[model samples]
Target: RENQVYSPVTGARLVAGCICLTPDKKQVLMITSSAHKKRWIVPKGGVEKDEPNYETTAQRETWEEAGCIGKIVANLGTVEDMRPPDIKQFENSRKDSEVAKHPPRTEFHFYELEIENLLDKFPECHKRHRKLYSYTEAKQNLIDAKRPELLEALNRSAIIKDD
Candidate 1:
């Protein structure tokens, strides 16, 4: 059959997360990769058991990656297929793995969570370095393809609120 089911080996192959921000609303939250402390990114991850509630699942990733809590500001948007062209070899692999049942690959979904509480310590504290940025600084930091789309999503989220 051309169309079969797929399931992720670990949690949901799909992810949901927040463009989390600090309480002052002056700065947005971002984190550096734990491996080399190189690229910076928003908090995000795979859903547990396909949680079904996107808002909470997104927030859960923020909590896991940044150890922060917040109020839901907006759905923001989705960032997809950002893996670099070379590293990205797309095909029937989805049909070959645990996600075989999933029958598809997709992108990361983002939500705007206006942060309320930031914990002193979190699961990734030792592995990652976190920071806050003004919207302008955030713009300067959007060097990756995914980051730019995320910014565009943020713009859309604002537009949504404006509407």
Candidate 2:
């Protein structure tokens, strides 16, 4: 189904994404939001037809959105989309009193991808800009973007050392 998957357990839309980290795990990759150039975000997308699993969806999104190819090193578990209502949107847009079935939330399955290739050309290169950020810088940007869930996802990964 071209329509994104919904959790059988909670009916939330299923989303998969990744935090693309350097081989040394010192720098993390971020990309501009396709909807807003000024806003930065990690690579993520809804599960579409032909994708077998969450991990593949995560890797494909990372590659297409961030121009990155990598292997998953760790699973960050699933999280609820807790963005404020003002920023959140319905999974599909068909109109209010019509065919639209709005999911109450989106469940993000995050992973940590150890980048093997940072390509100059990929699927979304023209549409999105990619950059590397240190842990502090990344955190600050995500905070400025008001994406608490993404910050939590980053925290869940081992990209930042405990020290």
Q: Give candidate 2 regions above 4 Å deviation.
A: 84-104, 161-163
Candidate 1 lDDT (Cα, 0 to 1): 0.65
Weakest 10 consecutive residues, lDDT, candidate 1?
A: 3-12
Q: What would the TM-scores of all predictions be?
A: 0.68, 0.83
Pick the TM-score winner.
2
lDDT of each: 0.65, 0.86
Cα RMSD to native, each candidate? Answer: 8.8, 7.6
Query: Largest lDDT belongs to which candidate?
Result: 2
